[PDB]
Design an enzyme around this catalytic site. Structure first.
Site, PDB file in Angstrom:
ATOM      1  CG  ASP A  95       6.633   1.017   6.323  1.00 55.11           C
ATOM      2  OD1 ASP A  95       5.882   0.143   5.843  1.00 55.11           O
ATOM      3  OD2 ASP A  95       6.286   2.211   6.389  1.00 55.11           O
ATOM      4  CB  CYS A  96       4.437   0.012  11.487  1.00 57.49           C
ATOM      5  SG  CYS A  96       3.222   0.865  12.502  1.00 57.49           S
ATOM      6  CG  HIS A 135      11.987   1.894  10.744  1.00 59.16           C
ATOM      7  ND1 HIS A 135      10.655   1.759  10.361  1.00 59.16           N
ATOM      8  CD2 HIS A 135      12.282   0.733  11.383  1.00 59.16           C
ATOM      9  CE1 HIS A 135      10.200   0.583  10.785  1.00 59.16           C
ATOM     10  NE2 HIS A 135      11.183  -0.070  11.357  1.00 59.16           N
ATOM     11  CE  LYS A 153     -10.491  -3.334   5.510  1.00 53.04           C
ATOM     12  NZ  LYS A 153     -10.485  -3.337   4.011  1.00 53.04           N
TER      13      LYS A 153
END
Length: 212
Positions: free
Chosen positions: A19-20, A159, A47
């Site tokens: 959602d970026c 979005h 990560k």
């Protein structure tokens, strides 16, 4: 030669992209150009040293452009265009200066649970200007086709249309005939339909930070 993406994951579901905003800018640009392509998601806090070398927060979208990596909302686009071997069109003119009213506006207003109604119609006022540009020019926002202008604004408008559409329902009124008609295209252009984020993971993925 082949280029693609190391991005935020959909939160709680590491298969669909997250959602970026800048995540879908560059995904859309590459699928619209129909290039061969490389990389995949950063899976929600998973990560390793590879992604910590690549992404500056370990959880921010990047482009992997021929094994070089850049990550800020405009930089991710402009260097991607410059280093793409297919012909780019990295042009933000007046159509983007109108876009710079609208982009922080609808983000703030979907996020806002103010008495926002007169100010929701202040976004409508800025969209009325945008409605004017297409009804004069004909095609998409940049005046002839989807270029870096449309590729910057449309991904975060997807979005908008899932989040505001479900949480705080306000559909685009049909008096803004451009804005409604071309958003219909954005929901189903072959490129955009493939690169869309999950609806549920923008709605119940971006707004719980806004709630609590």
């Amino acid at each position: 030669m082949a280029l693609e993406i190391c991005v935020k994951a959909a939160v709680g579901a590491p298969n669909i992209l997250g959602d970026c905003p800048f995540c879908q800018r560059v995904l859309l640009s590459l699928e619209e150009k129909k290039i061969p392509y490389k990389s995949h998601l950063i899976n929600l806090g998973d990560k390793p040293q590879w992604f910590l070398e690549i992404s500056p927060e370990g959880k921010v979208p990047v482009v992997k452009i021929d094994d070089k990596w850049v990550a800020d909302s405009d930089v991710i686009v402009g260097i991607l265009e410059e280093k793409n071997p297919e012909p780019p069109l990295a042009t933000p003119p007046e159509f983007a200066s109108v876009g710079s009213k609208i982009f922080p506006s609808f983000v703030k207003f979907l996020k806002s649970k103010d008495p926002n109604d007169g100010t929701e119609q202040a976004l409508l006022e800025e969209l009325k200007a945008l409605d004017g540009h297409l009804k004069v020019h004909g095609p998409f926002i940049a005046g002839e086709k989807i270029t870096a202008v449309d590729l910057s604004l449309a991904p975060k408008l997807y979005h908008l249309e899932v989040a505001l559409g479900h949480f705080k329902n306000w559909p685009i009124p049909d008096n803004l005939t451009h804005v409604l008609n071309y958003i219909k295209l954005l929901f189903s252009r072959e490129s955009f339909k493939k690169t869309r984020a999950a609806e549920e993971h923008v709605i119940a993925g971006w707004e719980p930070k806004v709630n609590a």
